[PDB]
Design a protein around this ligand. Structure first.
Ligand SMILES: [Cl-]
Lengths: 12, 45, 45, 45, 12, 12
């Protein structure tokens, strides 16, 4: 879920 | 009149690339929210 | 110079249809993730 | 032929604004589904 | 969550 | 939720 969360702010 | 019409199109093309790149990021961003939605379901229901 | 500018526009128009169709699918796709978000809330809170 | 090409571009530009505004709303809409996803996680896990 | 829900139908 | 899930991969 960290990858999920890192990726969230990453693609946003 | 010709030249300025060619300059209009460069702009349009430029803005269109911006659009396509943003959409690419929106699709992946949606892939991620799907994962999380489905993940929360497993734990709970 | 005229003709090639008309060919540029066909392309632009072609890419723009692609964009609009993709966006239509993104909006419905978002409708679905909204349902799931709200559904999970009901069960849990 | 010139004039009609300038009218084609007005349309293209017009449709492109529509696209950009819709995308703005899609990004914020996605911001909101992210909040809800992360919120449901806290309560549950 | 009401702001969240008001905003949902708002931006959609 | 199957319609939901069928539709997910459908529109993606
Ligand atoms: Cl466009």
């Amino acid at each position: 879920w960290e990858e999920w969360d890192r990726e969230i702010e990453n693609y946003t | 009149r010709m030249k300025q019409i060619e300059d209009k199109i460069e702009e349009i093309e430029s803005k269109q690339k911006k659009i396509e790149n943003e959409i690419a990021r929106i699709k992946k961003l949606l892939q991620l929210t799907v994962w999380g939605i489905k993940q929360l379901q497993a734990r709970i229901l």
